[PDB]
Write a protein that binds this ligand. Sequence first.
Ligand SMILES: CCCCS(=O)(=O)Nc1ccc2n[nH]c(C)c2c1
Ligand SMILES: CCCCS(=O)(=O)Nc1ccc2n[nH]c(C)c2c1
Ligand code: NA
Ligand code: NA
Lengths: 414, 414
Amino acid sequence: QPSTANGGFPSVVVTAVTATTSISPDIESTWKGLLAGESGIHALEDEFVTKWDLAVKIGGHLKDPVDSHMGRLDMRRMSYVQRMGKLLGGQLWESAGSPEVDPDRFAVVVGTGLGGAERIVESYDLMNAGGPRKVSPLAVQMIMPNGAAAVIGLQLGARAGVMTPVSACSSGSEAIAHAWRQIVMGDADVAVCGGVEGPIEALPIAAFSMMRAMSTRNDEPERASRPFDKDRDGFVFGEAGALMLIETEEHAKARGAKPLARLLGAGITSDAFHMVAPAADGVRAGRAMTRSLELAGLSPADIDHVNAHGTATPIGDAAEANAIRVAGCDQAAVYAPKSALGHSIGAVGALESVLTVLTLRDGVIPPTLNYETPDPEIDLDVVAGEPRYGDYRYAVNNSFGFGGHNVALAFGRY
Amino acid sequence: QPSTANGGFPSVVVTAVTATTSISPDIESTWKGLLAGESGIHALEDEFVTKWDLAVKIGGHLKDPVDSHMGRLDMRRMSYVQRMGKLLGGQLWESAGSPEVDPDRFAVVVGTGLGGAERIVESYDLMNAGGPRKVSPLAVQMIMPNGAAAVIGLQLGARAGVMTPVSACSSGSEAIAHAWRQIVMGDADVAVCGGVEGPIEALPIAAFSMMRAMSTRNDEPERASRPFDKDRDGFVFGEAGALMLIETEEHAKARGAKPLARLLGAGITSDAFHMVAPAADGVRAGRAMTRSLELAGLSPADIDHVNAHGTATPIGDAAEANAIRVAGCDQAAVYAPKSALGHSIGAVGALESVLTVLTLRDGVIPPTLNYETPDPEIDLDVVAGEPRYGDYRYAVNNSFGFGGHNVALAFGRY
Ligand SMILES: CCCCS(=O)(=O)Nc1ccc2n[nH]c(C)c2c1
Ligand SMILES: CCCCS(=O)(=O)Nc1ccc2n[nH]c(C)c2c1
Ligand code: NA
Ligand code: NA
């Protein structure tokens, strides 16, 4: 049976990364802030918080708003996720040295949680006011959830496939998983992959906080996101978008690209348990970790680091603890970046994949914020207090999205 | 290099199909109607046609509405695409003999064009009226575009992956393409795959008809959809949903399942040309056909039948004609089912995949409706007038969605 280790799969490496987060618009500045213990979660200063008197008053808006880089033309012909996709796609290409690859071997896989949904209401209102002819001829290409990926493929010239997987919190990781599949199966040699997601606003907060899924610790914004802590009470929103450039090792060496890490394998399973809650069991989530090891050619003992899903919901963190143990990776050093960066749904899997690559490159894991009283039935090696420097050789990033979608990406240090 | 023919890929077969269309709720009755020259496109009797005085007054609503099978409980806890997914998923399982498969080897891949979008406006209005606490705790699982696939996976117990690809008109075909990948890579042995899509209403008509993409022949509803005809003036909406059951040949023989056809290969490329228009060129669309042949192990001479994308837009049909010729399949017998069934966006690729399977099983191609004056620069072997019975051994179904997403599925007679 083929794997990355035995040569059945071509070696795929990560050569460029880009992200915009609640800490910084530059991924390297975000990484530095994460190591200094910074948090992007603050008190929400928007008027919709006091307009509706929401139970959740905290969150992390993007440090540098997307639309501050958007002129009038872009503001009326693209949805938000498309504008974020265009800005990130442009920054990623420049960071990669603006290489000139074969368009017929160039794929794009960008996940998202919803799509250009705000343009649905705009066309809804424009039609109620002026009739059917007041709807823009660009409404279709702005509304369609594949729009962000289509914009990036069109901007970069990717003709080996433009794909948009949708699986809530795992969209961004699943996009990287399919991009890896697209390369190891021979359909592409280079791929841009990641996830984009819209901003924080009233209705998203209302919908998620009625599931009792969000933290209500509005008095201390940066202490609210407490993954694996006893005092956790749900997740906190943190806006993000992230893309990475993956390609075969042959393709990277032929253009003089210094790879940051190795993309080894990817496992996609499902719970078939509940529409929003994860299986407390954790077998299928752990099976996704195991599956990524089989395709990578590794064993659970090789896994030094787990970038956990860690939303800080009571049920989710417990389910992941069982998942990590089921996969046999309970001895690894665990990091929950949502402690500092919050949850960005369709983008967070991509963002945490970048953080996983950065952890392998620099041999350091940022501290899990607010990890003060470890929950007794969650016995994990949670990095806390200060960054832990270590010989991290192989790492697994976890994404367990609403709907029961489990994605596990296996990364190795180059 | 591995392929289906040389044994590098396990043989995958189609064992069950289900669809609801504008002609019939039963796929076999729809097939019979297609052979009798029936059309599902009528004059729209809804009030929103006269309320807005839309330019398009024609279309095909589902012959048997989804909600007529939906009680009060289902009507308030599921979006439309989820209700259609549940009904189709239940009918498909019963048609397959209700087999008892390994949940850990059972995958679901269901594409859609948008998602549970109507629930966004409902929560939008419910919050404006009663505040954030009048939003249902089920809003998230109803709105998320992965919701339809998640419902089907939960209902059928699929734990080897639940995936939702979004690529406009190619969503339904791409879902089958990823399900085939999920099996040939060893992640699953059996998979439910297809596409669902919402109904026809005012704003969808307004958005697509402002691109001048839709036919306005309201005087003769059934003559409006004219793929490859000189008098064509765009596509016509026709509601549909479709799922099929694919599995390895070993898995099918071990449960006594009579396979209907063979799923041989799948090619996914992209144009990177325009956000809605296809490349008049047609290279990348043809490359998706070629790619599906490489994975199948075939040559363009083996292709006896092409189930065309054939939307009946002026630019789209011309682009596909070049694509078919670029792929070397210009001698095959072409069918454009959108002549009779219309366009169902996220579902139509799945529906036409079922029609492709049925064409291979019964050795017959229904007539392309309204193909009376063939366009001079489109020289294709378009089946017309009456069903053409023929020795169809291998067929390719085409899907070229808005955004430049090209999916080609290669099918073979069992
Ligand atoms: C971290 C914030 C997550 C918010 S979200 O999950 O509800 N996603 C989206 C997607 C599109 C959108 N358009 N306008 C808004 C407010 C959107 C929100
Ligand atoms: C063949 C008809 C295609 C119409 S569509 O392309 O605009 N799709 C959707 C999706 C969800 C929906 N909810 N409510 C409506 C009306 C929806 C329409
Ligand atoms: Na993670
Ligand atoms: Na077709």
